[PDB]
Structure formats: C-alpha cells, structure tokens
Amino acid sequence: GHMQDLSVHLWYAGPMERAGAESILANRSDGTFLVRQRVKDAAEFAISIKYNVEVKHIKIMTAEGLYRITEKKAFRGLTELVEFYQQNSLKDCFKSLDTTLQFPFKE
C-alpha cells in the first residue's frame, strides 16, 4: 500500500509456480528474474532468475522478518532483497552462479 508493495514491480510474480515462473524467464533473455509468493515452511517468497538458458528458482526465507535467497544474505523485504542481489554477484550468495538479478519478467 505505497510501502513495500511488490505488485508495483516487474520482477514480482507472487502467486506464481516454478514452471510458470521460468515460463517467462526461460522465454525471456538471460539475466531475467522474478519473485513468486508461496512455499511450505522454510521460506516465504521464491526468487527465479534466467541465467544460462535456464531459470534458477530459490525459496526466500523470512529471517527475523528479513528476506534472503541464500539465507546468508537477507534484506528488509523482497524489493530490498531482490533489488540488491541485482548488484550482489549471485556467485557469492548462490553457488555455481555468475550473475545477478539482471532483468524482471513483467518488463
């Protein structure tokens, strides 16, 4: 509500699935990323990035209210968490990664 609103972004898919999330990202160019809202427990939202003709999906955690993709590096919320990994080389937060939140999916 004019705060941490996520639907105002283009990388936020919220009620989206894995195959669905990558549907756009896979179709989109490399670096394309998005975030969905759903899980089961050890997480809240899920981040999906198109890197290497593939879409890497991860279940964000809500540590003390902070959102984190790797759980090692978190932020205030999603925007702050997704609008930072775009600079923070995933290779440091993720694993065999070598990029960052390049582009959204609604773009």
């Binding site: 899980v39 999906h57 790797t70 759980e71």
Partner: peptide, 13 residues
C-alpha cells in the same frame, strides 16, 4: 521435488 525450489543454495553441508 525437482518441480519445487530444491534448496539449490543456502546452508548445504
């Protein structure tokens, strides 16, 4: 499993 975020990176090992 492969259909969901199989915890790719976070606290493995």
């Amino acid at each position: 499993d492969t259909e969901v975020y199989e915890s790719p990176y976070a606290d493995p090992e």
